[PDB]
Structure formats: C-alpha cells, structure tokens
Amino acid sequence: GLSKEQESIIKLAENGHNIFYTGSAGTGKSILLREMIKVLKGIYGRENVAVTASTGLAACNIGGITIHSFAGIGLGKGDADKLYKKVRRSRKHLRRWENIGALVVDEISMLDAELLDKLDFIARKIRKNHQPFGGIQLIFCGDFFQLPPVSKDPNRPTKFAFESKAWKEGVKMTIMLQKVFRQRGDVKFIDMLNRMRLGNIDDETEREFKKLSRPLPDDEIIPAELYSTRMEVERANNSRLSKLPGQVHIFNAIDGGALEDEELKERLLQNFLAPKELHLKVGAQVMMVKNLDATLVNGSLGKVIEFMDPETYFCYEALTNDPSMPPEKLETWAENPSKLKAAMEREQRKSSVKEGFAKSDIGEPVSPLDSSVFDFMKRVVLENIKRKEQLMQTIHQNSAGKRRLPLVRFKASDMSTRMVLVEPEDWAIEDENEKPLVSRVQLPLMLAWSLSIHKSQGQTLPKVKVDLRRVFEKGQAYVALSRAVSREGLQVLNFDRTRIKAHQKVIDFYLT
DNA sequence: TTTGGT
Ligand SMILES: Nc1ncnc2c1ncn2[C@@H]1O[C@H](COP(=O)(O)OP(=O)(O)O)[C@@H](O)[C@H]1O
Ligand code: ALF
Ligand SMILES: [Mg+2]
Known part of the structure; x- marks a missing residue:
C-alpha cells in the first residue's frame, strides 16, 4: 500500500518532466522510485531507463547499477573533455547514452557537482543535443542533510549536486514527502x-x-x-567471523608484476579494497565488490552456502535442479570421475594466474560439506535414498589439490535468489602502456555484517x-x-x- | 577518516 503522496509523484513522471523529490530519511523515496522505474520503462522500454545511484549498494536497493558503472566513466576524476572521449570509445556505453529516455539517480546527496556537469557534457555531445541533459528525463532522489559527496581534500569541499550548472538548468522545483515510514511506530x-x-x-x-x-x-x-x-568495520566483521562456527577459509592474493618498488607499492597493495588475505566461513554474509554481470553487481549481498570446486559444484547443481534425481546418475560421476569432466566441460593470458589461486595442496585434507547444504532435500515416509548425500561427499573429497571457491547465494533487488561460484577477479593500476605495474588476484567479496x-x-x-x-x-x-x-x-x-x-x-x- | 572502475 503506497501512499497517496507517494503515488502522485509516480504519475508526475508521465509528464516527461524532470522531477526531484526529497524529505527526511526513511520517507518512502527509494521505495516509490521502484514503481516509478516500472512506469518509465513502460514509457521508453526496459532497456532505456538508466537506474543508478551514488553508491553501488544504494543502487541495488532500487535495482540498479552505480552512476559511474552506467556512464562508462570509470572513477571519472579525469577532464570533462577526457571522460567524453572515453565513453564514445565503448559500444555498450556509447549507445547507452544514445538511447536512454530517463536517468533515475538515488541518494543524490553524495553526487558532486563537478561530476554531474561532466555527465551533462557527455549526455549532450553524445546525444547530439543541447537541452539540460541532451533531453534525458532526470529523476533525482535523496536528502541533502544526509552524507555529502566524498571530499578527499576537506579544504576543497566537494560542491553538492545542486551547486552544478546542470542542476540549475534542469531542476527548478523540489517536491517533498513529509510522512516518515521507517521508524513509524516510535x-x-x-x-x-x-x-x-x-x-x-x-x-x-x-x-x-x-x-x-x-x-x-x-x-x-x-x-x-x-x-x-x-x-572499525573490517574489525567488527572479523569479530563476527571469529564468533561464527567453523574454520576460516583463507584466500590469499596473487600479486605482480613490475620491478622493485616498495615505499608505497604495498601502501598501493593495502590500498586495493582487495585484502591480501580474505577470510570466509559457511554462513557468513558477503557483498560483491565488482560489477560482474547484469544482476551481480557491486553491492549484491549474499550468504556463503559452502565451498566447492568446479567439479564438486557441477554435481551439486545437478542435484538442485533435479532434487528427486535417481541415485544412480551420481555414482557414475562419484565413482567414475573421468566421465564427470566429460559431462561437465562439454557445456561449451591471465588464465594461469587465476589457476594457481585457491589451490589446495595435493595432499591437504578436505573438510566434508555441511549438512546445511542438503536441507533442500529435507522437505518423509518410506525410503530415504539420500545415499546421494554421501555420494556428493565422496565427489567433494576428490577435490584434494583442486581449486575450492565459495558458493554464494545472493538475494537480489526483487528477492530473486541466485547461486554463483565466486571465481577470483583481478585488479590492476596500469600505466599509459597498460604494463604489469601492480596486480592482485582476489575474491571479489567482502564481509557484510x-x-x-x-x-x-x-x-x-x-x-x-x-x-x-x-x-x-x-x-x-x-x-x-x-x-x-x-x-x-x-x-x-x-x-x-x-x-x-x-x-x-x-x-x-x-x-x- | 569516506565513494566510485571491469
Ligand atoms: N507506502 C509505504 N507504506 C509503509 N511502509 C513503507 C512505504 N514505503 C516504504 N516503506 C518502508 O519504510 C522504509 C523506508 O523506505 P525507503 O524508500 O527506503 O526510505 P528512504 O526514503 O529513506 O529511501 C522502507 O524500509 C520501507 O520498508
Ligand atoms: F534511507 Al534513505 F534516503 F534512502 F534515508
Ligand atoms: Mg532511498
């Protein structure tokens, strides 16, 4: 039950008019945005409303990507003229600017004017126009009394979104919701x-x-x-990991590859957001930190189910898709593991570096899977034929020396859950020659309590x-x-x- | 002291 006031701001977007609404924290802004994003798609097509926000986690709340990730501008600290030349050199991102009919942007208080104006310059020169934003309808959302954009230098205050050229050109009124919903009892x-x-x-x-x-x-x-x-966040996430039943699984970063600098190169390698050492446990809460696909983006939250390797996972997936499978199909890949790689990789330079990553030793023992991961078969009258439960376990034991990787269940914006096996991603700061200056392979996951x-x-x-x-x-x-x-x-x-x-x-x- | 890239 959306409120009358919340409903009218949705209709108003049928005007094509830029709308900017606000009102103190927890007033329904980002919820009504979800439904307004439905109507703006129904007006220009699913593929042509850009649903963004200022921080990638806040983007997922309304079901979308970061403003930088949509824009194709990277960090966008570069020149106004510079970013534009970078966007136009990417088919995905170029024709994304060519084609959008709306730009929804939630939590606008953390957008800094300097960037908005860069995005305005890009929106015009690409869409071949001179309107406020090349004519893109702007939906702007947030409360400016919450966090301002991040001032690296705090002696150059970073010029909140409304200080920009582009804002004064395109926002000539504010709507304001007043009823508070979050704390609505107290x-x-x-x-x-x-x-x-x-x-x-x-x-x-x-x-x-x-x-x-x-x-x-x-x-x-x-x-x-x-x-x-x-x-203090990292510390309290460990103080919770230590409190969680089970061993930690240490995932150690792989690092290279330019010649000997160490005055800041590990100040450069602590400064990655990719910890040199990442600890996880079964039942931990993780958050993706890399935009990887359409629904798996920086800011997706998840809960580790157990750790597997590809082969042990290919089998586990088979059983989730056929939860009443005949137990015979398993023993064929359990006790005949030659034919498992047969059935599996029939489905279709950095590849060696991510090979040696998460490699258990040839002899290191293999903790058995948790009985949690078999609760989906645990809906009960006559014949329990989860020998299948033991069968999987034998398959897992063969991963001795194989590559064991956290199997995460992620719960998306629409609460659609999706299980993925989180291979390592890689980060690098690169020169004009792209040379191996500083590299790090690591899991793209952080703890999220x-x-x-x-x-x-x-x-x-x-x-x-x-x-x-x-x-x-x-x-x-x-x-x-x-x-x-x-x-x-x-x-x-x-x-x-x-x-x-x-x-x-x-x-x-x-x-x- | 903080965010943001593929
Ligand atoms: N129409 C509504 N009726 C009741 N509760 C709502 C309504 N809209 C949102 N809420 C609840 O209030 C909280 C604030 O919603 P949200 O849109 O995130 O607020 P904010 O305006 O700070 O983004 C949400 O957790 C949501 O559960
Ligand atoms: F929770 Al908000 F603006 F999205 F206060
Ligand atoms: Mg919101």
Whole structure:
C-alpha cells in the first residue's frame, strides 16, 4: 500500500518532466522510485531507463547499477573533455547514452557537482543535443542533510549536486514527502531523529539517545553494525567471523608484476579494497565488490552456502535442479570421475594466474560439506535414498589439490535468489602502456555484517548497532542513527552532541 | 577518516 503522496509523484513522471523529490530519511523515496522505474520503462522500454545511484549498494536497493558503472566513466576524476572521449570509445556505453529516455539517480546527496556537469557534457555531445541533459528525463532522489559527496581534500569541499550548472538548468522545483515510514511506530524516536537532521540535540534528546547505549537483545538475530571508517568495520566483521562456527577459509592474493618498488607499492597493495588475505566461513554474509554481470553487481549481498570446486559444484547443481534425481546418475560421476569432466566441460593470458589461486595442496585434507547444504532435500515416509548425500561427499573429497571457491547465494533487488561460484577477479593500476605495474588476484567479496556509514545510506536495519566514534562529515551521525526501525532495535555508542552538526551550504539551499 | 572502475 503506497501512499497517496507517494503515488502522485509516480504519475508526475508521465509528464516527461524532470522531477526531484526529497524529505527526511526513511520517507518512502527509494521505495516509490521502484514503481516509478516500472512506469518509465513502460514509457521508453526496459532497456532505456538508466537506474543508478551514488553508491553501488544504494543502487541495488532500487535495482540498479552505480552512476559511474552506467556512464562508462570509470572513477571519472579525469577532464570533462577526457571522460567524453572515453565513453564514445565503448559500444555498450556509447549507445547507452544514445538511447536512454530517463536517468533515475538515488541518494543524490553524495553526487558532486563537478561530476554531474561532466555527465551533462557527455549526455549532450553524445546525444547530439543541447537541452539540460541532451533531453534525458532526470529523476533525482535523496536528502541533502544526509552524507555529502566524498571530499578527499576537506579544504576543497566537494560542491553538492545542486551547486552544478546542470542542476540549475534542469531542476527548478523540489517536491517533498513529509510522512516518515521507517521508524513509524516510535514517535518520540522520530522527533529525536528529526532534531538530529539539523544539529538540534537538546539536553533531553542526548540523555534519551544515551539510554540507547545498552546492549541489543542477544538472540539468533545477528545484528548489523555501522561504523565511520573502514578499519572499525573490517574489525567488527572479523569479530563476527571469529564468533561464527567453523574454520576460516583463507584466500590469499596473487600479486605482480613490475620491478622493485616498495615505499608505497604495498601502501598501493593495502590500498586495493582487495585484502591480501580474505577470510570466509559457511554462513557468513558477503557483498560483491565488482560489477560482474547484469544482476551481480557491486553491492549484491549474499550468504556463503559452502565451498566447492568446479567439479564438486557441477554435481551439486545437478542435484538442485533435479532434487528427486535417481541415485544412480551420481555414482557414475562419484565413482567414475573421468566421465564427470566429460559431462561437465562439454557445456561449451591471465588464465594461469587465476589457476594457481585457491589451490589446495595435493595432499591437504578436505573438510566434508555441511549438512546445511542438503536441507533442500529435507522437505518423509518410506525410503530415504539420500545415499546421494554421501555420494556428493565422496565427489567433494576428490577435490584434494583442486581449486575450492565459495558458493554464494545472493538475494537480489526483487528477492530473486541466485547461486554463483565466486571465481577470483583481478585488479590492476596500469600505466599509459597498460604494463604489469601492480596486480592482485582476489575474491571479489567482502564481509557484510558491518557497513561504513556511507554504504549504510539507503538501507533499513531493524536490529543494528551504531558506533559514532570516528564520525567526521556532516550528516554521518544522522544517516547512521536513522537506519534503525525502533529504539528497541538500536544500540548507539559514543554519542557526542557536538560531532552532530549540519552542513551550512544545505540550510542555505533549503531557504535560498 | 569516506565513494566510485571491469
Ligand atoms: N507506502 C509505504 N507504506 C509503509 N511502509 C513503507 C512505504 N514505503 C516504504 N516503506 C518502508 O519504510 C522504509 C523506508 O523506505 P525507503 O524508500 O527506503 O526510505 P528512504 O526514503 O529513506 O529511501 C522502507 O524500509 C520501507 O520498508
Ligand atoms: F534516503 Al534513505 F534511507 F534512502 F534515508
Ligand atoms: Mg532511498
């Protein structure tokens, strides 16, 4: 049941008119966007609405890719003129600009004007036009009192989206939803959150937020944890991995390939987001960090089911697709593993580097599969003929020396679940000659119980812990505390009335 | 202290 106000903003997009809506955290913005994305596709075709957002996880909430990933601009720190020449040299991305009828963009507060103007320049010169965006309908979404775009230099403040040429050209009104939905039970809580949107903590709200520094109820509901910087996040994801039953599976990065520099080259190789050492467990929660295909993108969340190799997986897949299979078909690949590679790879320079990656030793023992992974056959009267359960296990044991890789179940935007075997991807910073300067093979997965407050923006975390220990940018404490649905579900550490203040540029916007 | 690429 969408609200009347939420429904009208959807209709309004039938105008073709650029619309920009807003309203404090958790008002239904990104939900109604989902249905407006349905009508904009029904107007220009599925393939011609660009559904993007500022951070790849926030993109998945509305079912789409990052603004950079759609645009083809990479990081887009380059010259306005430069990016355009890069986009036009990619058929996929060129004709993507040629053909789009809408650009939906959610969590706009983290878009920086400098980039919007670059995208405007690209949208025009490619679409051969001079309208606001080469005439693309803009749907803009968010709350500017939440996180601003990331200022690397904090003595060049990064010029929020509305400071741009392109915005003043194409946004000449703001709509504003006012009813709050996320916290909708805890009314005092909402008022407490609203006076945090501005920096108006009083003597009483502080005391009431400090009452929330108690411990979350301890049950099997694993709580989400939000911290300011990536260190405390990484630390709390391990503090949860250590608490999870089972051994860790260490995945060690493969690194090359230019001559001897080490003053920053490992400052370059810690600076990859691809840890030199990635630990996982069965039942862990991971998030993809590389755009890999249409529905498996940076910001997909998943839960590791067990670890397999290709061959042990090809068999496991067979059984999920025929869950009442005759047990004979298995023993043919169980006890005749020559004919398994027969049936498997009949289905169709960097290949050797990702070969030696995740290679168990020729003799290292092989922990058997979990009995969790056979619960799908566990819907019960007469004849249990899961000898098949033991059969798979024998197949798994043959992977001694083979390449064992985490089998993840991902739950997509539309809650469509999809299981993939996560091969390693590779990262590289390359020169003008593309030379092997600095390379790293690694799994494109991160643990996802904890999130930086930035990646936390967009999500609803019913049970959540918040540690405002290092909060630095304006809005950061608002975004974090505003994730929780109830005070019951919330725990807050290190409350500091003075590290909670609002950006002046934005109050100026909301009144000039 | 933070995001973003294939
Ligand atoms: N029409 C609605 N009625 C009831 N609850 C809603 C409605 N729309 C959204 N919600 C809930 O409120 C929360 C906020 O929705 P969302 O669109 O993410 O807010 P935000 O505006 O901050 O992006 C969501 O978790 C959603 O479950
Ligand atoms: F803008 Al939001 F949760 F998507 F506050
Ligand atoms: Mg939203």
